[PDB]
Ligand binder design. Structure first.
Ligand SMILES: N[C@@H](c1ccc(-n2cccn2)cc1)P(=O)(O)O
Ligand SMILES: [Mg+2]
Ligand SMILES: [Mg+2]
Ligand SMILES: [Zn+2]
Length: 889
């Protein structure tokens, strides 16, 4: 396998000026004719002409309308087409070809493929070379003129980029459309779609130039009534970019299309965005509440790529974080503004500190700009997207809104063009930084280490208060553990948003202040501090770091009650739980290792329980926040703090802490679950397709969280509540009724009732599968085998496969069964999936990422399964490279 290095970037010695495509789709094959108008670039050194082209069946190739001869003038090995230089012209010339491809049997979902009755393309990153020959790298910009033909009855709707310029009838029941897209684009932004598509549409009038933009959202006919929310999300997304960034859509039309079979969430092809149906379609009757935030963020994300990816483009794939990290940052600012709930930011932090921190301390650790790759298929990671987004968000923290907006406008003005690199972005923020400091010596040079250095920095704190002097000092230290990418880790530029809270009255003692930590350690001193403060550190989670606050639980409890920053309040509560978790885990571990006949456990801090009750009982406090404070930190967050983690000991620890708190608060939880009903489940706008109330949904989250706590505890007669909840019209409630009934004899009665409610909507059936998979059932292995035989069968839909298996892999007791049977089962699924879809096979490897963090026995069980998968003779390149890197071999 060839390793591509970032240091090795060089421009092509060719240019492709114009692509003219004819894509003729037939029952058993698709014929693709392509003419490329080419030139020799100024970098050319007389080399062979080499096209990417994977799995293509050549009918013929030509230069300037003369057929080329296989063997004597060119070789093709199913990956590269090599035309020997003696036969390549030295001025403007035309290369043509006709190849045959087979979208019907393309089950890897990359290139051109069939999803149910829709034909659709997926070109990022290197899928265009599965459609026709090309120099398939993002710096090859060309013009595109595309014609598609197909059977009119099967494929009445034909779409590709640009203007539809001609439509025409073809003998034998066929038809055609031609689309011309004159502005230059990279080939990974080409798209085509054909199908019996239905739609909703609206007209949006831009803010400044008042251009009419037509918006179309498409699906298969069955689900067209689930498109309205997506259309509202698109309007909101355009308004946002207009209001916050001053940016208007440049084209006359934007199409959104939902497909059933898709590897990720969606894709930003220019004016033709294609989506996983689960991230475009929703209704109140047939979707859980999560689908509403999901569609808003995914529609938003692909819209924002129209500037950050599509008009300012990447030179090479190493700069991927520049388009993805920045688009995620734009997406998160939009979500925050649209939902107006504090749990939106908290949920982004929850994701980074569980999943991304785990990745960053694993053998897979990489900086947000890597120095090498082998498979572009495995490069689209939480580190590139989500830590990339936190790095892009730190510029805004450092500069503030006014100067951030100035530096961004600087980057967009200069590079609307025009490929760019991460240094160009940094340069633009620097110019805003010079202007902010009003000092032109000031620079962001050290900031660049955020792109190049891998691993999570640890940031720790000591304090001093001199009561006579009224002088308060915060001593800060940063450290990043050496790893495979850097032996010596340099200090980063770490912005620490802070407040100082008066412990007597809960008030702020200082204005907004962001500490700029630029050295291994520094001491920040504040004068005129009248009383000893509690420091509120990393407000908003202002850098992607392990925060070691060194506060007492009494201080943490005070922040949790009285601080103004949601993240700090949640983090204080998190740190109280972690102190408790590590304590009880070591007490359980000692008792198991020493085989003790009796031992003691440290109870949960009583004043922390009192503070939870105080917050729950506060009718003005936020319900979404309340659901965060009654839940323990995620297992994948906990694992970052324990060596050789025994998952059974952690399951017993979590069980003890939940029971400790429930034994004090279950009456309070019951009362709230009942008093929340009226507002949480209010049906007033149930038939209003466009009315989405994020606060109401967070009330439902809370009720569903409290119901789960009450069921685990077997609170008296709670089954009555579960059975009533199953009759709710909201799928969030009735699916919740299924999972909490796991602890009762009614489980299979609700399994059947909710299957029946779910079975006729393809997405809602996928949510039912996830609910079953995640159910806390002792017979969960037999239940999985039942879903396999009855519901999943041999589905190659990645949504179906992921729904049956991924939630189960989070079942701490059972997936991690000491016999290794769970690791066995997931490995069998990965290998089976790898036969047809290597990308999804790699996604199904996710539970294995923490393998070297677990206890001795479990490390060995997981390594065994990874080595077994690695030894499969038919392993894909993608799965092989991933598992070799994961197992350090
Ligand atoms: N850029 C989009 C996308 C689509 C597909 C893939 N993909 C990566 C490997 C194979 N397909 C990557 C990104 P997005 O960030 O999902 O908007
Ligand atoms: Mg083929
Ligand atoms: Mg299906
Ligand atoms: Zn993206």
């Amino acid at each position: 396998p060839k390793i591509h290095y970032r240091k090795d970037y060089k421009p092509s010695g060719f240019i492709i000026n114009q692509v003219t495509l004819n894509i003729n789709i037939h029952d058993q094959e698709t014929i693709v004719r392509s003419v490329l108008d080419m030139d020799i670039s100024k970098h050319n050194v007389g080399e062979d002409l080499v096209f990417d082209g994977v799995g293509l069946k050549i009918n013929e190739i030509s230069i300037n309308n003369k057929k080329l001869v296989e063997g004597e003038e060119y070789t093709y090995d199913n990956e590269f087409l090599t035309i020997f230089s003696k036969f390549v012209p030295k001025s403007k010339f035309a290369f043509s070809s006709e190849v045959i491809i087979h979208p019907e049997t393309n089950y890897a979902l990359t290139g051109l493929y069939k999803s149910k009755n829709i034909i659709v393309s997926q070109c990022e990153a290197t899928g265009f070379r599965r459609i026709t020959f090309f120099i398939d790298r993002p710096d090859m910009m060309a013009k595109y003129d595309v014609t598609v033909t197909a059977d009119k009855e099967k494929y009445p709707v034909l779409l590709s980029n640009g203007d539809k310029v001609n439509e025409f009838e073809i003998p034998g029941g066929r038809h055609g459309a031609r689309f011309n897209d004159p502005p230059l684009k990279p080939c990974y932004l080409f798209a085509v779609v054909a199908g019996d598509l239905k739609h909703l549409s609206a007209t949006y009038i831009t803010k400044y130039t008042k251009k009419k933009v037509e918006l179309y959202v498409f699906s298969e006919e069955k689900y067209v009534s689930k498109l309205q929310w997506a259309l509202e999300c698109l309007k909101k997304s355009m308004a946002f970019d207009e209001d916050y960034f001053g940016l208007e859509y440049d084209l006359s039309r934007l199409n959104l299309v939902a497909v059933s079979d898709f590897n990720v969430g969606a894709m930003e092809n220019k004016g033709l965005n294609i989506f996983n149906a689960n991230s475009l379609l929703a209704s109140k009757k047939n979707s859980i509440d999560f689908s509403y935030a999901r569609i808003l963020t995914v529609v938003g994300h692909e819209y924002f790529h129209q500037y950050t990816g599509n008009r300012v483009t990447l030179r090479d794939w190493f700069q991927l974080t520049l388009k993805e990290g920045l688009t995620v940052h734009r997406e998160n600012l939009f979500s925050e503004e649209m939902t107006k709930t504090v749990t939106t930011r908290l949920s982004h932090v929850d994701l980074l500190r569980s999943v991304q921190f785990l990745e960053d301390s694993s053998p897979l650790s990489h900086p947000i700009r890597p120095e090498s790759y082998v498979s572009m298929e495995n490069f689209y990671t939480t580190t590139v997207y989500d830590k990339g987004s936190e790095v892009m968000r730190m510029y805004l923290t450092i500069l503030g809104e006014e100067y951030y907006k100035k530096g961004f406008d600087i980057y967009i003005k200069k590079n609307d063009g025009n490929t760019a690199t991460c240094e160009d972005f940094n340069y633009a923020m620097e110019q805003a930084y010079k202007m902010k400091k009003a000092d032109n010596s000031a620079n962001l040079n050290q900031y660049l280490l955020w792109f190049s250095q891998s691993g999570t920095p640890h940031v720790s704190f000591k304090y001093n208060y001199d009561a006579e002097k009224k002088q308060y000092s915060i001593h800060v230290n940063q450290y990043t553990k050496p790893d495979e990418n850097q032996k010596e880790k340099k200090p980063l530029f770490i912005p620490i948003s802070v407040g100082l809270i008066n412990p007597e009255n809960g008030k702020e003692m200082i204005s907004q202040t962001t500490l700029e930590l630029t050295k291994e350690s520094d001491t920040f001193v504040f004068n005129n501090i009248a009383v000893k403060p509690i420091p509120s550190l990393f407000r908003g989670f202002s850098a992607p770091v392990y925060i070691e606050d060194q506060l007492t639980d009494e201080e943490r409890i005070l922040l949790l009650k009285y601080d103004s920053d949601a993240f700090v309040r949640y983090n204080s509560c998190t740190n109280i739980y972690m102190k408790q978790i590590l304590m009880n885990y070591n007490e359980f571990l000692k008792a198991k290792n020493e085989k003790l006949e009796s031992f003691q456990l440290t109870p949960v801090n009583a004043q922390f329980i009192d503070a939870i009750k105080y917050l729950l009982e506060d009718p003005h406090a936020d319900a979404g926040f309340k659901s965060y404070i009654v839940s323990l930190p995620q297992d994948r967050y906990i694992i970052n703090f324990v060596s050789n983690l025994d998952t059974d000991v952690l399951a017993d620890t979590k069980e003890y802490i939940y029971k400790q708190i429930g034994d004090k608060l279950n009456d309070v939880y019951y009362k709230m679950f009942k008093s929340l009903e009226a507002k949480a489940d209010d049906l007033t706008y149930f038939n209003d397709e466009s009315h989405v109330d994020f606060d109401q949904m967070n009330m439902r989250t809370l009720r569903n969280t409290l119901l789960s706590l009450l069921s685990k505890a077997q609170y008296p007669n709670i089954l009555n509540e579960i059975i009533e909840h199953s009759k709710s019209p909201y799928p969030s409630n009735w699916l919740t009724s299924l999972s909490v009934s796991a602890y009762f004899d009614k489980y299979f009665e609700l399994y059947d009732k909710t299957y029946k409610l779910s079975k006729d909507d393809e997405l809602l059936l996928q949510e039912w599968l996830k609910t079953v998979s995640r159910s806390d059932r002792k017979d969960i292995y037999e239940i999985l085998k039942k879903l396999e035989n009855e519901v999943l069968k041999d589905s190659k839909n990645p949504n179906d496969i992921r729904a049956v298996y991924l939630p189960f892999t989070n079942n701490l007791r059972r997936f991690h069964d000491i016999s290794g049977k769970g690791y066995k089962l997931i490995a069998e699924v990965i290998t089976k999936t790898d036969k047809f879809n290597p990308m999804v096979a790699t996604q199904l490897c996710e539970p294995f990422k923490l393998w070297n963090k677990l206890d001795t026995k479990r490390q060995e069980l997981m390594l065994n399964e990874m080595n077994t998968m690695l030894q499969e003779p038919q392993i894909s390149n993608n799965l092989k490279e991933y598992l070799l890197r994961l197992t350090n071999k």
